[PDB]
Amino acid sequence: RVTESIHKVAERVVTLVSMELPDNVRLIRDYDPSLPELAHDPDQIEQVLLNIVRNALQALGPEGGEIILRTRTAFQLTLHGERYRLAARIDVEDNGPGIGLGLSIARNLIDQHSGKIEFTSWPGHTEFSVYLPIRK
Numbered sequence: 001r002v003t004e005s006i007h008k009v010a011e012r013v014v015t016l017v018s019m020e021l022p023d024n025v026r027l028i029r030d031y032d033p034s035l036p037e038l039a040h041d042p043d044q045i046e047q048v049l050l051n052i053v054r055n056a057l058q059a060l061g062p063e064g065g066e067i068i069l070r071t072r073t074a075f076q077l078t079l080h081g082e083r084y085r086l087a088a089r090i091d092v093e094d095n096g097p098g099i100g101l102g103l104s105i106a107r108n109l110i111d112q113h114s115g116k117i118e119f120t121s122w123p124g125h126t127e128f129s130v131y132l133p134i135r136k
Contacts, residue, residue, distance in 0.1 A: 005037050006035060006037075006040065007071065008042065009042045009045045009046050010071060012042075013046060025066070027067045030069070030070035030071070032070075034073055035072070036073070036086065038133070040132060041109075044109045048106040048110055049069070049090070052117075052128045055102065055103055056093075056126070059096065059099055060094050060096035065095045065097065066095040067094045068094075069091070069092060070089075070093065071090050074087040075087075077131060079115060079131060086133075086135040088132045088133075089130070091128070093128075096124070106130075113132055115133060116130075118131075
C-alpha cells in the first residue's frame, strides 16, 4: 500500500531482534543504498523477516554465531514465470559452528506480495533469500 524504503522495515526488525539475541550471536547489516523504494506492507514484511531471523537463531543454536541481514538490488529477476527488470533481494544468512508456522506465514505473506523465498547452503552457512518486485 505504501511505497517506502525496505530499510525502514529492516531496521525495525534489527531493533526487535535485539531483545531475543543471545550473548554469543551478532546481527550485522549489509545494505544496498542504491535499492529503490518499493510498494509493500511494512507490517507484513516485518513479520516475514522476524520469522526468518528466528529460524536462523534456531539453526545457530547454543553455539551461537552471526546473522547477516543483507539487501541487494536484483536485476532481471524471475517471479512466477515473468522476468522483472528490478526486484529487491533480502537475505538472512547465518554462520555457526552448530550450523514451522513462522516459515509458512512468511511464505504466504511473500506470496501476497507476488515475490518468492529461496533457501540455500554452503560450508558453515545457511541462507534464506526473500525477493520482492520493484519494477516489472
